[PDB]
Symmetry: D2
Subunit: 236 residues, 4 copies
């Protein structure tokens, strides 16, 4: 089995230092260029996904699209899941990152930001930045949909989708591409490689460079993962 | 939303005093009759399933196969999932019950059976009662398949199927019928009714009597769940 | 690719000499026994379907079920289609076959019965034996659903399902089983083997004996088709 | 039931005077703009697709990919099918239009283009413009894939997809948007509106302007189909 991970480029909210989470912000101008770059790289390195999986967030879907266009594999079957979404950013959604750094303190900031299991505070249902009741989730059990998340919770909800849905395709011989987010992709990597809960806070997946994993029959790295641009990704 | 649960009747293993779990034991002539009764109740009380969900275990499949024939709704779409399978009994699978009750004194016997948090001994891959590597689960991530299960674990691997899949048909106005097993059905009832970890071990759903649940937009019981033959069930 | 065809046993209406068509009549007692026999044979001859396709008619679905139970492959994924249904029997639906033989004459009878392209008359929408508006077809384009059919028309509607849906599985490596009817199966065979339109009237698929076809990459017989009980088939 | 059709704009082949058919030619910078306009109309007029259907041809895919981004409905489920592909132009695929107009006199040229019942010359498997054996169609019965197509044939292989698949979402209250091609869209309009074999050759749907169809329970137009920019379509 062959799997390809792609982290979308920057979000418009990202360019203005705002916490996005499940807010459906779109890609930035350079975000869009990285998508082309990612697709460009996909073609260059001869990696052809047979299927596409994306979250329900437009910034990821755009990336997948601009990338497949450039890769010449737009015809590919596509499935989307709330499960591959970014980490819900609780009450922190839509708030300035420099400003949240001074509201709380570095300690509590890195907790609400990088605590493996401490999610930001729950966002109020009436806040303009909560998507509780959003059209794209009307068919999902209302109760599973979070109002805040941590990488811990994210992994919980991501794994089933990988176990049943994504895995069936991998096990069928198809090459899959997953256009997703930072925390959602980070969670799959932690799981995919066997990284401790204390170490996961140090791994960051760069945006715009396809990360490939050649998996064995048990869906585990048969060889080490690789970026299609080891040089750019190496930078950090 | 309307959900109808149906627990299969007796298998030829329960009939012979054997723990079953995930072994694909056939339904006994007595079970087959209870299913026809389940289908009869469905028809008599006007419970018209629009979609059918079952496990990967034949006794649950056969039950629906017979229940639906008598309900005259055998055309209904069928969907199956390991996630709806009976709790995996581990090492206890190919084991005479009366013998393990003696082998292990109450302390071990009663716990393995009704403990919510602690599972039975894992069954080895060598055992002729292990499912490790079974065909019907070759398209599922090998690392997720359990070798033993507590109700806790069952509720855990079942919830995401309920949340994404069954929830969609339910939220689409499709009356869904589910054919599963004791632990899986109780595990779902507990979530719907919010039964506590300490109280769930008390609950039991009669074999062969359809259970209807009227649900609201948030999939919560809008009124108490009822059996189609309240009288036959009440004798529990 | 490996494909398995199974014609359900007799219908309750069949035992009483009535034209069934799309009427949702169920299996007869012996019909049910042949299903077991078919599944029995499936196991015996080591043919294991990975997927199941059935029409929307209960007499076919039952057969598939009783058969898979006996074969020990109930866990199999299942899909159903109005396209694999029996030939709609027009105004002839629910009518006595001996009696229809005397209403019309042998000539017109064998026309309304075996004419490759002359369907029985259209059945009136109000007749107790029309399923126009039936629950199992509410999601299908109202206009495609027939009110009479001939093997000709049947093949038209059956082919797309075979082309897109059944073919994808065959092309994916799966072994497929199709629990269907006389005309629907006859149509797939005519197509599968390249039998003329004038010759198709002579081929009849026996009920209760799995017919297997070992297909090549182009979905055509790589070897000749075979029943899992060549003897009874003969 | 509500259906919204959207014909893709110009490809880099139309731009260079080449017949396209089933060749997977890219959408030109001009087509890309018409799609953003299609998405804008969708948003402006409040046409909210719930599901998206497209062909296996990138220009149709890209159109939806852009139209939906501007409509802010990029999360909508996507379904694709060869059955929604443009008519297969046969031997005329990798051919300069002005040249075939000269090569063949009106008798042949105009017919291949607008005849309803008679198709173009079959393209050979050797041609670098044949799709025989293409990856995106490896899961479809090899015997069904056309080497040439008349509108008649297109309407024929398209109808069953419409009847079983699109019909289900339509009958489930899902507003469905379809991104296809001139012949496929006209072929569907003719069925919906019952246009005759002789009249269909007259119809044409403007590239880039969404077309809405209000349908009844039997999927018949409950009122005339309208363009989201009636004025631009009227030109």
């Amino acid at each position: 089995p062959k799997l390809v991970l792609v982290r979308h480029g920057q979000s418009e909210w990202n360019e203005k230092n705002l916490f996005t989470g499940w807010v459906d912000v779109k890609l930035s101008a350079k975000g869009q260029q990285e998508a082309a770059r990612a697709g460009e790289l996909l073609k260059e390195k001869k990696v052809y996904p047979d299927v596409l999986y994306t979250s329900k967030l437009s910034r990821a879907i755009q990336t997948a699209n601009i990338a497949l266009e450039k890769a010449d594999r737009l015809w590919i079957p596509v499935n989307r899941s709330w499960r591959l979404n970014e980490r819900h950013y609780g009450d922190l959604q839509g708030k300035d990152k420099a400003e949240t750094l001074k509201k709380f303190g570095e300690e509590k900031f890195n907790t609400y930001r990088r605590s493996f299991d401490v999610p930001p505070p729950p966002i109020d249902a009436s806040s303009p930045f909560s998507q509780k009741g959003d059209e794209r989730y009307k068919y999902v059990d209302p109760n599973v949909l979070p109002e805040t998340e941590s990488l811990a919770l994210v992994i919980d909800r991501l794994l089933p989708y990988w176990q049943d849905v994504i895995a069936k395709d991998l096990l069928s011989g198809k090459t899959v591409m997953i256009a997703a987010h930072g925390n959602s992709l980070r969670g799959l990597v932690k799981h995919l490689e066997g990284i401790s809960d204390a170490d996961i806070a140090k791994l960051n997946i760069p945006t715009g460079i396809p990360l490939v994993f050649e998996l064995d029959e048990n869906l585990k790295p048969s060889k080490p993962s690789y970026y299609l641009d080891p040089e750019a990704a190496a930078a950090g």
